[PDB]
Design a protein around this ligand. Sequence first.
Ligand SMILES: CC(=O)N[C@H]1[C@H](O[C@H]2[C@@H](O)[C@@H](CO)O[C@@H](O[C@H]3[C@H](O)[C@@H](O)[C@H](O)O[C@@H]3CO)[C@@H]2O)O[C@H](CO)[C@@H](O)[C@@H]1O[C@@H]1O[C@H](CO)[C@H](O)[C@H](O)[C@H]1O
Ligand SMILES: [Cl-]
Ligand SMILES: [Cl-]
Ligand SMILES: [Cl-]
Ligand SMILES: [Cl-]
Ligand SMILES: [Cl-]
Length: 139
Amino acid sequence: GPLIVPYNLPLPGGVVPRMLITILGTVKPNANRIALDFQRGNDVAFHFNPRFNENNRRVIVCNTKLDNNWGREERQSVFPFESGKPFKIQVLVEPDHFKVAVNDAHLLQYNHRVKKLNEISKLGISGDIDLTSASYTMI
Ligand SMILES: CC(=O)N[C@H]1[C@H](O[C@H]2[C@@H](O)[C@@H](CO)O[C@@H](O[C@H]3[C@H](O)[C@@H](O)[C@H](O)O[C@@H]3CO)[C@@H]2O)O[C@H](CO)[C@@H](O)[C@@H]1O[C@@H]1O[C@H](CO)[C@H](O)[C@H](O)[C@H]1O
Ligand SMILES: [Cl-]
Ligand SMILES: [Cl-]
Ligand SMILES: [Cl-]
Ligand SMILES: [Cl-]
Ligand SMILES: [Cl-]
């Protein structure tokens, strides 16, 4: 059934290439943000952050947080989410990037800044969503 948000999905032994993480949920009406945070302890290896109202625009911000400091943002103006609507996010771990698809369409890639993939052992899911499922498999 429904999952509680914020939700913490353990990734035992960290991530590896060919691991596929699938998140299903629905965006709340009047949403402000969604965030997926792949964590290495206190560090955020990959923060994927759709913003519904940044200066009255919709944008996806991606970044990494090391020692409590955010790095250089990567921004994507292609925005597949909509308030009130169900979505599927798939994150595929590849050798050199995370690859993100939304509703079965490729969205973006993010080059690995944190290189100890085996230590990226939690995924935090937060924001203005109803969360239906969060799981992983190997492809
Ligand atoms: C205030 C807030 O929303 N804090 C969030 C945190 O948000 C930061 C990230 O999204 C980064 C990504 O680059 O951007 C930061 O804003 C940038 C902005 O994009 C730039 O235009 C501007 O120049 O600089 C600012 C600041 O660098 C966001 O502030 O995201 C994390 C990870 O999802 C959240 O945890 C955090 O929310 C707080 O989390 C706390 C627990 O860790 C508490 O729950 C607290 O109540 C939250 O506010
Ligand atoms: Cl961790
Ligand atoms: Cl922060
Ligand atoms: Cl919207
Ligand atoms: Cl790759
Ligand atoms: Cl590292």
